[PDB]
Amino acid sequence: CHPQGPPC
Amino acid sequence: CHPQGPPC
Amino acid sequence: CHPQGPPC
Amino acid sequence: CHPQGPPC
Amino acid sequence: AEAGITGTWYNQLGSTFIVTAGADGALTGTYESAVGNAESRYVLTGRYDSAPATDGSGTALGWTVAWKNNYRNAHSATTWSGQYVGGAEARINTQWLLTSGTTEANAWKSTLVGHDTFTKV
Amino acid sequence: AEAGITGTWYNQLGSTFIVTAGADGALTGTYESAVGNAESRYVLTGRYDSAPATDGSGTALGWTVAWKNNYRNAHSATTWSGQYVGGAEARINTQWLLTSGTTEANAWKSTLVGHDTFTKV
Amino acid sequence: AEAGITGTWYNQLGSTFIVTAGADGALTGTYESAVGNAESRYVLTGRYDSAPATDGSGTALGWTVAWKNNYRNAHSATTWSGQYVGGAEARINTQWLLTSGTTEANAWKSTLVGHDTFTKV
Amino acid sequence: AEAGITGTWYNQLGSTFIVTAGADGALTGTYESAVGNAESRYVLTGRYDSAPATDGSGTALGWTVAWKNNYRNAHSATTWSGQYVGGAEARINTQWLLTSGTTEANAWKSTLVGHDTFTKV
Numbered sequence: 001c002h003p004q005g006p007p008c
Numbered sequence: 009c010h011p012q013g014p015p016c
Numbered sequence: 017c018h019p020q021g022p023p024c
Numbered sequence: 025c026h027p028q029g030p031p032c
Numbered sequence: 033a034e035a036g037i038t039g040t041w042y043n044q045l046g047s048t049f050i051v052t053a054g055a056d057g058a059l060t061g062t063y064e065s066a067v068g069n070a071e072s073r074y075v076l077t078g079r080y081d082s083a084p085a086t087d088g089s090g091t092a093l094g095w096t097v098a099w100k101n102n103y104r105n106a107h108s109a110t111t112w113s114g115q116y117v118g119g120a121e122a123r124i125n126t127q128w129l130l131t132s133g134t135t136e137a138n139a140w141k142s143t144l145v146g147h148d149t150f151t152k153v
Numbered sequence: 154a155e156a157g158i159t160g161t162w163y164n165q166l167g168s169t170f171i172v173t174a175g176a177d178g179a180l181t182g183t184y185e186s187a188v189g190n191a192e193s194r195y196v197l198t199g200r201y202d203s204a205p206a207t208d209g210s211g212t213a214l215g216w217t218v219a220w221k222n223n224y225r226n227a228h229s230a231t232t233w234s235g236q237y238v239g240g241a242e243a244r245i246n247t248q249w250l251l252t253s254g255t256t257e258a259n260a261w262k263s264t265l266v267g268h269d270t271f272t273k274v
Numbered sequence: 275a276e277a278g279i280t281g282t283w284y285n286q287l288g289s290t291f292i293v294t295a296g297a298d299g300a301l302t303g304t305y306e307s308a309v310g311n312a313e314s315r316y317v318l319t320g321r322y323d324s325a326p327a328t329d330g331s332g333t334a335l336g337w338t339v340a341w342k343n344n345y346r347n348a349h350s351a352t353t354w355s356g357q358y359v360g361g362a363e364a365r366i367n368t369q370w371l372l373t374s375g376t377t378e379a380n381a382w383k384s385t386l387v388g389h390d391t392f393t394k395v
Numbered sequence: 396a397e398a399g400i401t402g403t404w405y406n407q408l409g410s411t412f413i414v415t416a417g418a419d420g421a422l423t424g425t426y427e428s429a430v431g432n433a434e435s436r437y438v439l440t441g442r443y444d445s446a447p448a449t450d451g452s453g454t455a456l457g458w459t460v461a462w463k464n465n466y467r468n469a470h471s472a473t474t475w476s477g478q479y480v481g482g483a484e485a486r487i488n489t490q491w492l493l494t495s496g497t498t499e500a501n502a503w504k505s506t507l508v509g510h511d512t513f514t515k516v
Contacts, residue, residue: 007309015066030428092228092253108213114264326496336494353457353492375448
């Protein structure tokens with residue numbers, strides 16, 4: 001859940 | 009007008 | 017070990 | 025002679 | 033995939049490509065840029081990876097087109113890398129690399145990158 | 154080009170690809186990743202644009218490899234886009250796109266980009 | 275541009291970035307991924323090229339976000355390169371590169387490429 | 396990293412960039428293309444992700460340069476995404492995207508992709 005995707 | 013664009 | 021890297 | 029190439 | 037891939041696809045710019053997905057991963061067809069004249073058809077060849085896989089993943093594939101035919105020679109080639117997603121609204125989402133042949137001094141600026149989404153409609 | 158392209162090429166990682174450049178732009182061959190076993194050979198197909206051109210430009214070409222063979226299925230495909238430069242020290246400089254088949258949520262991170270230079274030595 | 279750029283932009287995935295375009299090419303702001311919590315805000319900095327130009331061209335710009343903040347460290351950074359087009363339906367069309375820090379053996383697969391379009395709506 | 400990053404770096408084309416890595420992820424400096432004249436210096440700003448991490452991984456970072464200064468306006472911007480690897484032979488390996496501002500018809504061909512490796516020597 002890389003910060004550039006959704007969510008997270 | 010490279011063959012990969014429009015038109016041509 | 018994706019086939020495009022070394023080894024594999 | 026785009027500033028990112030040589031020279032310029 | 034395979035069956036699903038074979039057919040005509042159109043992209044958001046007005047280009048069309050007709051392809052046949054053969055049983056063992058081959059993709060063969062033609063790409064036509066515009067007008068609707070023979071002069072805009074180029075051969076394409078690629079491969080697709082049949083899995084395919086139990087969790088709805090897309091089918092990875094890629095193809096190449098060298099921009100040379102009997103009416104034009106654009107000294108370049110484009111490769112499209114992407115995945116096919118079938119279903120009601122089937123699409124092929126790709127990212128492409130277009131490289132033109134340059135002299136060694138201009139080699140640093142010989143490749144353009146872009147993206148295309150192709151639909152059956 | 155053509156003649157010049159046909160042969161074995163090696164890249165800085167230890168991969169080898171053998172290709173035949175046919176008279177009308179076709180590129181056909183195999184790509185082998187490592188070890189030196191059949192399990193690492195994959196089919197490749199591409200096209201090259203013969204010009205070629207009077208000012209020493211390179212020959213644009215591209216090819217695709219779907220990472221599926223009788224021993225492995227990596228649910229992905231790579232396309233290499235680049236140019237061939239012959240001569241004493243002939244090389245094929247490329248940029249590549251590797252796309253893996255994903256679910257639609259992970260589609261944003263399905264393509265890796267890299268570069269490779271292949272030599273005859 | 276400048277004035278036009280300053281503001282909130284949203285992309286097709288649900289991310290939001292607020293940026294201030296300063297008089298001399300600077301872009302400063304924050305990028306928030308989702309939820310609507312501080313934990314998803316990262317600093318962004320970039321530059322834009324004011325021309326701008328008499329024939330409706332877009333404004334080139336780019337920015338970077340290192341995915342580290344006080345709640346998360348994703349050991350990676352993304353750069354977005356694109357152009358701003360204002361007007362009724364203003365948008366920033368970009369292509370991005372996300373690089374993760376790897377060991378030297380995995381360096382070949384350390385960069386993902388994608389694209390994003392941001393709107394004010 | 397940080398300490399290690401601050402300094403002068405040179406790439407294989409003859410460009411030089413001087414950067415300061417600040418304590419909280421900032422990268423600030425100038426990029427000079429050639430000749431050794433003020434006319435070739437452009438501001439750069441970026442971010443780096445300090446981890447950094449116990450297994451020798453590289454430090455991800457990225458920066459942007461808008462090609463506008465008091466002597467030239469090239470209506471474009473480049474972003475470099477890559478990782479810093481220190482040590483005896485420290486280098487910053489990057490992939491870059493150069494976008495020029497276009498009219499909407501030429502937008503499909505507005506971004507070039509390339510790669511650069513920078514060393515301290």
